[model samples]
Target chain A: GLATILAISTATPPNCVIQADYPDYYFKITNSEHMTELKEKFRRLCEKSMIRKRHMCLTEEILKANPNMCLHMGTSLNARQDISLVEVPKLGKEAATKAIKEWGQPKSKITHLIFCTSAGVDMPGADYQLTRLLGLSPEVKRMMIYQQGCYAGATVLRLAKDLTENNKGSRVLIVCSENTVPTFRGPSDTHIDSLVGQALFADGAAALIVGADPDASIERPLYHIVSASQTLLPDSDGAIEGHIREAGLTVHLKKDVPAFFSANIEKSLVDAFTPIGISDWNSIFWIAHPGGPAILDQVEEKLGLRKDKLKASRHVMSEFGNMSSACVLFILDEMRKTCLEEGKATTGEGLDWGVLFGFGPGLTVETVVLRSVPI
Target chain B: GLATILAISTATPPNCVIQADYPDYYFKITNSEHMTELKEKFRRLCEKSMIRKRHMCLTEEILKANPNMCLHMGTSLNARQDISLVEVPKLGKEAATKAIKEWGQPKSKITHLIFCTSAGVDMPGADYQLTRLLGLSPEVKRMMIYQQGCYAGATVLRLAKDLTENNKGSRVLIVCSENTVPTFRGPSDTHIDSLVGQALFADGAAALIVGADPDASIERPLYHIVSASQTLLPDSDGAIEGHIREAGLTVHLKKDVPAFFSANIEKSLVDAFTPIGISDWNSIFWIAHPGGPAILDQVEEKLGLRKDKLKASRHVMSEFGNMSSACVLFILDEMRKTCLEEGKATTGEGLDWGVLFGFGPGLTVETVVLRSVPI
Candidate 1:
């Protein structure tokens, strides 16, 4: 009794800053010669990042009005908390509403709500906001999956699947969102780490509805979640990291992180999938975490994936950069839309299986296998 | 189908600060007459707190050597991260080792690992560290439940129970640890919030092994997990919160929190237990999170329980302060030991039940019902 993905809706903040203009924004904040040199490197990195634009909760206009709000200038705790408390909840509600509208499920019918994020700490949190804004039942079982960093989307879905499977007629609503504002560090902070983190991570919110029972009234593609697997590379603990500092949430990206993931990812996938009877790679559709261009390239080379196989991931990274934990759900939403647009129905032969791969702080790899099933 | 609590262990940093000496330490840092007047009130608060001492990672020796390291002076981000990265992993391993030793199960047998905390942020977090230290197989599905605030211990267990119930033969190891050193703020900062938070929260780590299959070789009182329920008080989201500031994590506690819990706890317990066929209060024993003296007193008064029922919670809170999410597990561990010492084996007739209550950020109340079964 696996849970089926009934619908997913994605939302980003109204502000999308083009990568071409990032250097200009950085130039205004840095006056020191060393900072100017760092700015040049930042621009060059963004050029190679495969991201053309990145969405943010803080608009360019807002950044212009309050130069202190810009990522180039380290933000104050008060400012960051203020923005996230307002924006993340709003974005979460928008995404949830769209998801509920798409799925045609009454707000009161949502049995469980799991909200995941690492960007901002809100008391009462965004989950409470969602319950209030969406008029969800007060009795809804709520789980807030906070500060798990990027892999939280898959983690929450795994729990949601378990909840739905264990309790008959149960439906779980999962939301993964990241504001990136509270975590934004000035490019002058850490040379490579700050530049890379600022360029790569952005704000996005995604909502998903999963349940044991499929909606028989609505005709849609049903992604029956088959299995989820998580593996941590032993002794590779320091490969990728995030910690709070005066500069904000400082992300320490190891220079060899891409190489580390490349080295362990294939073995991890084989180990994770083999136990779940998913040995044949050609039979599965792949959607991986687009951490960066180097990460995607390394994964593709290692797994022998076709250039077009990870198009959705590349498209997401290029257009919106990485939304952290929300990145995978964005890719998943894109995949779901593609399947619907193609009018592809699941065949009884089990031809459609979607394999999701996400990597985060632990150099941790989380994979979930989804099979298309007839409603 | 319910997961049975196999074994549990708890560990705290060796440095235990006597609550009586807290004001003396504060007096050294503050020379202002106004501040001295506030110190008198601080002492009075500690007198009423019922917390005699609290364990912390930062020792008196460390604070003596580096005056800035003192919580009264407010710690730097680098200092907190350094301590957490070094001490959290070490403490987590110690707790895990003892738990695994008590369970007598090979590390390889743990199919699922769940780690919960809200203390400090670490990339390739404590979960990865525990996995490496425990020598658990890389294939173990890991879920890091981070920053769910104080109630995260019960939150992770609820998920673990679901995982074990849904996936037969699954064994989940849960570790919850918090290092309050990072969030320590001086009374000079915010008036009551900083004083209350510093007075209550402390450092501790706890581990528990839960499984659907009970150990066949040993005769023990099995805490067979029956059901778990959660509820959020309406319009009470603003009551408690934790947000990062220049001082690191700052916790805000409303003055009326005790009354808030007292007003709603009885109905919440009834709502949680009624569905599990627990209508009679006398039939169930209680193990609740001892957040503070006020919180415990309120629950005791509202529930109409025997004075000694919450003795474990009272003792833990007094000796260790609030270990945040790890507090309830310490109480649970103490309960288990008492049951073991009493040699109270579960009878075939339905008699023994343990009800758990934990409150956190959303002003959320999480309840779990566990039925003792003979091994």
Candidate 2:
């Protein structure tokens, strides 16, 4: 028997940096005469890009005014850790508390706590701090999944299923938070890869409560995890890269990622979904990681998914840019909200079958199939 | 019902730096006149530390000659990543290959790869790189457990047990490697924490094969994991810290750690072992994380263990300084070797049961119980 998702919740920084502010932030950092033309081009992309605003823990004003804020090369590691020490626990705790509250289980009952992130590093890690802050019993098992990049949320869910299946009644709490400000690359950096990453990435925290209780979904609507699968594309190791750099984190995305995703993601989806009697592509709701506009478009075109099937995904992207490991949870949370607000699922019945997919550094694609049946 | 340890292997850098070299190394970097007296006292502690020599990925000569080797405040992040990218994979691969070869299982049959480390960060992570280098199938499941500090080996083992229990026939390959040189603190930074950290932590990698086949251990002697438990000590959240810096990663360990562990670890040990009828401490062998001389002493005194009970732990510490997440595996490997060489188990019967314990951030104590009945 597999574990079912009992509840999902998310939190983000209060400061929203609007997409329109990029040109001003960029112009201030760059001194090149050619930047006038480049800035115009960048502003056009921002206008066309779906991201409206993103919650950044550090304001763009602070980042641009102080060139040494984080984007400067050779920023001290102490500075990075100090900033994360403050932000990660506060934002991470906020989300975990909300999710646990919704799950209606005493914090002490959480048998396992899994914390996933790629944006920060600390010991007595976010997991340790959250356990103490959440007042969890000292006996709560803690596992930290770090630097797995965007697909980590899916990885955490898969792990939760394994743990729940092993111990029957085990309850696992997973909290994922990313503070991208430490890894932020400035507009003066003129690297298109860095520019795109800065445009799309933002701070976010998400929490999930998963277990095997049969009556879990009966008390409140929940997603029953039906199946999970993952595949690493051959010889695509360099297609996406997130490496530590003196400046902060160096992220590179090969332009062909959209083509690569289109070619590879289908089999993973079918393999994970087919066994659970999922067949009709039209009938399934898609909660694909909104990596960028181009990738989302490719996903829709390659998979023959209806445009509106990814509305929740698009809505999240518009409201908040990609949140790395926490992105999928935000999409799922949005989908749940939309279902309640619209009083309609993708089909006339309800949100019956849905698939969650994310891609990360391995040039890997991870997928989880979910059904809304009462656990 | 759970995964049994099939085989374990480890690898370290070829160069071994003797403890005597530390005084000269420290003298070269420090300018304080008062340090002359401190250095003499430090030399005495080195003699007593039991860590005669340690394997370091970066040479002490390079570190001393080039004071900027790893400790310059604004050292390039690229420089640190460059060293780690080369060392972590090479050392990590060596250990994983040896363990897999000893396990005698075809790479294709291994169902999961769990890579744990605190010494390095890279995109696609070590898990992805190892999977390709090891030529595992594309469908192999992968989990990257990163930066959980010293107890990560136990965490990986616990997760492996969970996966094997749920999947029944699943075989998990667990690899943990730490190359601490990139984060090495130089003597110019005279913080006592940095001084002690530099004296103790070293580079090492270890690998394990965990599966549930009863006949698996018939081919070779192995530790059949019986159970696992963990506890995070109260009010000790800040006792240990590992955070990234431009120079590399920084590790701070509070002086009160030994006191905290002595106070808290006994309960964790009792709770985990009492259910298995381990009423007599003398009846069981102990393989504890040799974090330092004081920690080992405290554990021995508090638990009332025999002087020779922690022989393997002491031997590992003497031979190689603590290897962070990889240290416990080294102890377990030593215990296995001692068992085979002596031709007798600890109690004069066949190897029956023992417990492995480690302390990490959160002042956390993680314990795993093992029994060697025919799997």
Predicted structure with the largest DockQ when compared to the true one: 2
> Which 10-residue window of candidate 2 chain A scores lowest in summed lDDT?
A69-78
Tens-place lDDT digits, model 2, residues A1-375: 568777889999998778888667655654333667667766776776788888888765555554654443545445556677668878889999899888886777889999887877777678887888888888998888878888887888888888887886788899999887567655553567766776678899999888876463443546767666778986676999987665667788788887888787778877877677676777877777886678789878987887688888888888888888888889888877767667765321265888888788779888888776422
Model 1 residue B358 distance off true place after TM-score fit, in angstroms: 0.6
Put down candidate 1 lDDT per residue, B152-271, tens digits, no spaces. 777877888888888878888889888876676556645576677767788999998888866577624357777777777766767887765555676777788888777888787777
- The parts of candidate 1 lying over 4 Å away from their true place are A29-40, A64-78, A188-190, A218-221, A272-280, A345-351, A373-375, B29-36, B64-75, B188-190, B218-221, B343-351
Candidate lDDT scores, in order, read 0.76, 0.77
The residue ranges of model 2 lying beyond 4 angstroms of the native Cα positions read A29-34, A70-77, A188-190, A214-221, A345-351, B29-34, B64-66, B70-77, B188-190, B214-221, B345-351, B373-375
Candidate 1's displacement at residue A20, Å, is 3.3
In candidate 1 the C-alpha lDDT for residue B178 amounts to 87
Score candidate 1 by DockQ.
0.55
Query: TM-score of the candidate numbered 2?
Result: 0.94
In order, the TM-score of chain B in each prediction is 0.92, 0.93
